[PDB]
Amino acid sequence: SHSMRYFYTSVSRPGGEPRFISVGYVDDTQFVRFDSDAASPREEPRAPWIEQEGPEYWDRNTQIYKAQAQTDRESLRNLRGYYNQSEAGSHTLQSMYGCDVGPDGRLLRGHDQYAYDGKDYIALNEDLRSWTAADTAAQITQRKWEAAREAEQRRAYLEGECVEWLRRYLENGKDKLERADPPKTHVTHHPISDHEATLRCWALGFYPAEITLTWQRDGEDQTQDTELVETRPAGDRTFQKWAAVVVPSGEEQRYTCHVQHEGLPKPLTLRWE
């Protein structure tokens, strides 16, 4: 099971074209980027394996980004109109689309969704045939896209070109994208007071990012009493996470951290301090 996903952000400025930034992921590996802030904006690589691509790739993609940026600038004006907002005032349009493929290599699911100024705006349903609008203004866009049979075109992209690009990228970097790097785990203790102590369970250098850390008090899972920090980037394409629990002092040894992850032969259990 694998995925490709593009993430677009457009931020219109008071006075100046909008800034358009795009990032491309395969699985949890950022592999391309584009920023409209350069004087010669180019699609640039951020994975080693996209580097096998010749100059035509980069040239063509740059053309598409600049065009998307252009569209987004207009979409942005249109939206100011829909919500009756003055032209004065920065706004944000975010876009996310991609395809998930099976171990097969065929489409599991397609994604195609938008958000304006933080809130959900419009999205493509799972049939890849209909639209879901968040407010009455997004229904303007909905009518427009239905009349223009837009669903057919996105379904076409999602089922076809998306998957083929993905299939290729997975070939190009098989080693890096098919290994699972399992967490280097351990536990730290903190005597925070006389009557309580903090047991914090670490997970370091893992890939991909999906993991579970759960504390258990005698095989009972302490779901609600645990601080779980959002999985964070190491800076080298791997992830760190930690889960911590505040336990009575003296009743420490009844607690165990359970680590689950794909790169792990079998679920770990740890304790101590």
Binding site: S22, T71, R154, W165
Partner: peptide, 9 residues
Amino acid sequence: SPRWYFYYL
């Protein structure tokens, strides 16, 4: 690669 389909909102 990015999708060569742009749609106006």
